[PDB]
Amino acid sequence: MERIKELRNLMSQSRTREILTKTTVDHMAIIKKYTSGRQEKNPSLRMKWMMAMKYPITADKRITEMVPERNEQGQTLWSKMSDAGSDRVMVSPLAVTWWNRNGPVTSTVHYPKVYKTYFDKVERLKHGTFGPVHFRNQVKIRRRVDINPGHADLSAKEAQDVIMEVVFPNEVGARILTSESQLTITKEKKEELQDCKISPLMVAYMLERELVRKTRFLPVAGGTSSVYIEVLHLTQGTCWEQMYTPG
Amino acid sequence: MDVNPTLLFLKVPAQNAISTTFPYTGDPPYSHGTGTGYTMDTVNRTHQYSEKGKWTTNTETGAPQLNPIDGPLPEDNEPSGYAQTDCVLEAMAFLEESHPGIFENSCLETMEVVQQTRVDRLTQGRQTYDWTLNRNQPAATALANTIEVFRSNGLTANESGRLIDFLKDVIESMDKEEMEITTHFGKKKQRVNKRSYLIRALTLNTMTKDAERGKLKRRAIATPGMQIRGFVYFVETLARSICEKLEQSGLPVGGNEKKAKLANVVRKMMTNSQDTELSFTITGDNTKWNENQNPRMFLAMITYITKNQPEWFRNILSIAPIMFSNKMARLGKGYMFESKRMKLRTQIPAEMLASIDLKYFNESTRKKIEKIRPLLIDGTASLSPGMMMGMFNMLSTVLGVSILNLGQKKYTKTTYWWDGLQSSDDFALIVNAPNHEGIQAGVDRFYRTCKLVGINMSKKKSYINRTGTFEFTSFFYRYGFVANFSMELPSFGVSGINESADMSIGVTVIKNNMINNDLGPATAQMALQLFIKDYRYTYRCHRGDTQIQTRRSFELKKLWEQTRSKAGLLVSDGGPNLYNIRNLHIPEVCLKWELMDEDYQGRLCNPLNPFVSHKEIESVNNAVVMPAHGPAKSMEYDAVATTHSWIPKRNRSILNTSQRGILEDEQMYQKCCNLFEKFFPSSSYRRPVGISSMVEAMVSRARIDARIDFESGRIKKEEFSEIMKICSTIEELRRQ
Amino acid sequence: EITGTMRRLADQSLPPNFSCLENFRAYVDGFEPNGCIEGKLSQMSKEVNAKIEPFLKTTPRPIKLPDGPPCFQRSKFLLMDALKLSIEDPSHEGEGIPLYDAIKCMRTFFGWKEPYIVKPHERGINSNYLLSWKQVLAELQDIENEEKIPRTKNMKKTSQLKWALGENMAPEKVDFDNCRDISDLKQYDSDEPELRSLSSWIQNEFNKACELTDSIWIELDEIGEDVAPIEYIASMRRNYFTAEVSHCRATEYIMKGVYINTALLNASCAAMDDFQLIPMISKCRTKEGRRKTNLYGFIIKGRSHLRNDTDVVNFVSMEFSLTDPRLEPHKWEKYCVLEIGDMLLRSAIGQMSRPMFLYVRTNGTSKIKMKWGMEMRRCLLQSLQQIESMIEAESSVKEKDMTKEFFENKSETWPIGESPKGVEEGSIGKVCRTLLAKSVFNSLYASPQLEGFSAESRKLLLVVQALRDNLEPGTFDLGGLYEAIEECLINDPWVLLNASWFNSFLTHALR
RNA sequence: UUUGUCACCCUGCU
RNA sequence: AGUAGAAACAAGGGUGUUUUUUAU
């Protein structure tokens, strides 16, 4: 087990035992963010400036066992330097193209289900019909509209409940689920999510974005429904109007 | 013929072409060198705009301080600072009768926030002043330092995690004769005294503002420290709660919400009497807003707001005004001297500005230094009677709305009405009277009222028209709000996060400008083409059939050659563009899905590649942007985590310094907080709690796993031995 | 609770009448709001009021303009005094080896005299520009004699080149403990710039920026094919607009600027300690089908250890021309003008012969300026959004698309300039071509003075418009607005033209 | 000029 | 020189090694 091995190797030398046995567990939230770098005021300029550098991006060290140094023609693909305050390596943007060129392949049967809320849009657009164009006045009133269908009638509490029961099962803590709808959602995701290798933060994020409701403040002139709003730039204008029924 | 574009305004109304005025296709003004001069000018103007007050030397700090409260009323029309007490209190007491119960509900709303908030929430925000390092540091790397210095001298109460206890710690730090602090210069130890510590803890940092548009001269802004930030958080919470319940305010909302209220107030005063009345509209600004408005009035309005409330509530709510009214501002970086005859340049620090010979400065600097010199105390400068940017904004807006509320019909007593909307300095007013002798009376009432609380109305940037046309902030009203594409123009470009976020937020800003800012179809198509062109140029990702020699070229053509369907390769890989008006709300990988072959899908979305980096949940599919008018905002975008979701590199000019021990530390912290990730794989979604050490937990949740999955499901019994062996070994190595 | 240093810190921070916080709270608590304000407005001096001075048709006055020496050219490259050396090759822009095309175009010419000095520079040693031009050719020769032309050439470092490029000229950094007993030791200079007055060449140069050419400079066709009707409507609007703007010279400016700033930023980040030779190359599409490449001159880059976004990098610019300088010497105040050959352009049967000129200059640019110069293509959007707004405004009072006739069958005209006989009007393409040149010049000459002047004249515009609409405007203080407008007019040649245009508008608008 | 004969690192928002 | 405008840039930090010597 690499876990207990690396633990024992940490608490075998100095400088690392006192930090682990002095820092309580309600304090690691602060020292996780202890950085010596600053959030940047001008990102566009820095991107344009850094793109002409030899080694502009950073990768995990495992690269040294997954990607060569010099490719078929002889262009360097990663460097031998460590980043500022981390154990990550500094790599060139040709390594991304390489990985996409001659790299390890996997399966993609779960990527549709984890990102269902996007593929809904994708195969709802290619099943819709058009009509005439009415060039006339456009009178708009500003209202509050739900910009997401809001899968369930629930709020944040039971949302975290179902998400922790589906993603982090052995650490839900104390409580159990109560009603039928949350159990149904739970078990559906239980079955259809088995044997997934996507990062659990990504699964939790997609389930939050797929399961909770968001509302905004927008100018409307036609119909007030949720499937219409996502196509709003295209249906209404200030002088014209396109007709559309999504599928 | 001599072409002259301005003549267009002979046929086109101005508001229908105002986008042609903003010259926002060039670079904005910046600053060079120091800002010491601007800070000195600011201190001197603050002490000049009120000089008929009382001087006293504070007992604790020992600083000359002026109290410009209940001073003499002003005579001429210059910017005054002599605000009354009864005026403030009557404004508050009238605003509360206007909105019944607005204070009690807000205090109820804020008490829970007080009693449940934890300390970690102070790790969010901008740069903060660090008094251990005497510099500017991010929030977390300052909270850690102040906690390490508090608990290394006996002050241990914050361990309960509540911020209400770190507050008590900050306070009881003020009652000690001596304080040990260390310096990474090995290290060292130094002993700071009581009043030196006070002065070091009542200090703000100052520096010049950059990339601001619309002005010829440069200004200065301030930065608070660590000991004051909690109480500021709390009072801002209360003030925001109050502001979200007032019709006449516009601060805690966005662009679209404000325009609805503007139209609402305009047509409220539009039509209740059609012939026997007369309306006028005042557009303008306020002058020297954050040079007046001293804290000793914030104290009174807070004491009024928190009336008939628990006593700890008032005591926690009234500490920020107290440290503000006793503050001491830094000066900057110093000056640079040059000798033309021997080619020598040198830097002098702001600490020598109380003793240096004066034979080195020009006339302006001499007459600034010799007027600020009666206030210099150990680098700082006594600044009692004013505020400065980075301050209590919501409470200023509250006071202004209270001033506007005084102009109801049952208060003005004769005929006059005035309404409007305020958001800090900016205000828009509307006056009514059935005459032309009544408008001047109304305007005079308002103007003379705003002088009694310290709100000096500018008179060289304002005008007065008949109703139906105005300009609030940069919005222009001509029987309806005309669009202004030039303000949002400076965002149509690459943002600089990575190759995956740029494509999303580009099409997203195009879409959001079509929906509200009233852009057009042809305009959006041409914007699309230009944006794809500059994207392809910035990231070296031209099409895969061209001859443009760049460095992702030898490789991209390879991916171009061994490809069946070339309409699946993403634009980041040298492929086509299937975007249009209808396709504008759909992610890229979700739109080219059905057209890629399997090897490409696999290699691209391989969920074990070494470039993807997720850190927490508050920073997934979210990035900060820098607009043209306003502060930095947060933008949420729709992407799909793939190989093109990487992170750029970090600055490395810290190795050549003496504060290298700030890197060592963080590295170790990482190598620890990473392992806690894999013994507890749920801490980036939810925050972990307890008061036990990090190794007790990592050994408690290390024996269950050997007996429950690998020895209650029939997996090998020969690893269980050594697992328990090393667990016992570790729990011995801690010497306990 | 509050006790200790904070009990006293609070017992000072009060009004100057109290000394105890508890009595302050006791006073504030039981205070019933009385008629305090309404009884205190009666003691103030009556010398504080808001007096309205009614804006009438005779109230405005001409903004005043500075006095002093005339203004000079400040741009990173020549605008109307440019002469291309062109060949024909089937390429697209961004595809090829620059020095190759440079040598081709250098061989296209025929008459290469020995060059001499027409107009000297007064403040700078003048032999150095001639010696530098007498070396660029030698490097071009020895890279044409070499077996494979690289993509970078490094100039040897000679005396005249460091002089021109400003190497080894920053003062030394020593402490204050040492040079404390030296004389002539004082602040850096922080004085107002030198004042200057308007000239005539800026308008003549804005005129040339609106006319037509015989080439195509912009290529905008890569997009997903259409499905819906609004797609087609937009694609016909785009066809028409791009048919009008594709031949303006502002587009050539946009291109020649984007190329230079891209190349200079990349070279500045690549090598910080060498001298590169970058040519100015453009590629265009002739009428009837042909495709050409054209050379404008050369740029030589110095050293670039750029740390902040306001640190400067120097460079030497050499451009070709046929315009003699002596007609206006005050325009070329910081140029050293040579004469480098003869050019023969044949008449019907007769001939014309003219000398050919090289303008050389030392100039500099920052890191924040190259970035914004690389983004000159948003001018198109700024110029086309307004015309789209006009079209869509007229095509909503008729219930019909109106983009058809506006560009060929036109009865509407907009006043765009004025002439010896008065104001005159133009079609829609003329407006499209003048707004685009304004948007390009707004970025070719950027300054804080432009920001100030725009922000402060936007007020006069609106008061004049409210007077024009019968909305009965007023004003509290009118002289201060004028003083503010005049604070910002110092020495910039483009903000001065803007102020003169504003005087013309004020004359015609309230005549 | 110097007690010298020559090298070496690092950093580009800290 | 030049950039630039109310003050700056025209690079900024550390590491070395040492009583006359016969030869290429």
Numbering used by the authors:
A (entry chain C): 1 to 247
B (entry chain B): 1 to 185, 206 to 756
C (entry chain A): 206 to 716
Passage from the reporting paper:
We report atomic-resolution cryo-EM structures of mini-vRNPs in two states: FluPol located inside (State-In) or at the outer rim (State-Out) of the NP–RNA ring. In State-In, interfaces for FluPol dimerization or Pol II interaction are blocked, but fully exposed in State-Out.
For the State-In mini-vRNP, FluPol positions vertically above the NP-RNA ring and its PA CTD is enwrapped in the center hollow of the NP-RNA ring. FluPol and NP mainly interact by NP-0 contacting FluPol, while the other NPs in the mini-vRNPs have fewer interactions with FluPol. Based on its best quality cryo-EM density, we used the model of the FluPol:NP-0:RNA unit in the State-In mini-vRNP to show the detailed interactions between FluPol and NP-0. In region 1, a loop in NP-0 spanning the residues I201-N211, which links two helices in the head domain of NP-0, contacts residues of PA and PB1, as well as the nucleotides of the vRNA 5′ terminus, close to the entrance of vRNA 5′ terminus in FluPol. NP-0R208 forms an elaborate network with other RNP components. Its side chain contacts the main chain atoms of PAA375, PAP376, PAE377, and the side chain atom of PAA375. In region 2, the loop region in NP-0 spanning residues E244-A251 have close contacts to the residues covering the region of K362-M374 in the CTD of PA (PAC). The side chain of NP-0N247 hydrogen-bonds with the side chain atoms of PAN373 and PAK367, meanwhile the main chain atom of NP-0N247 also has a hydrogen-bond mediated interaction with the side chain of the PAK367.
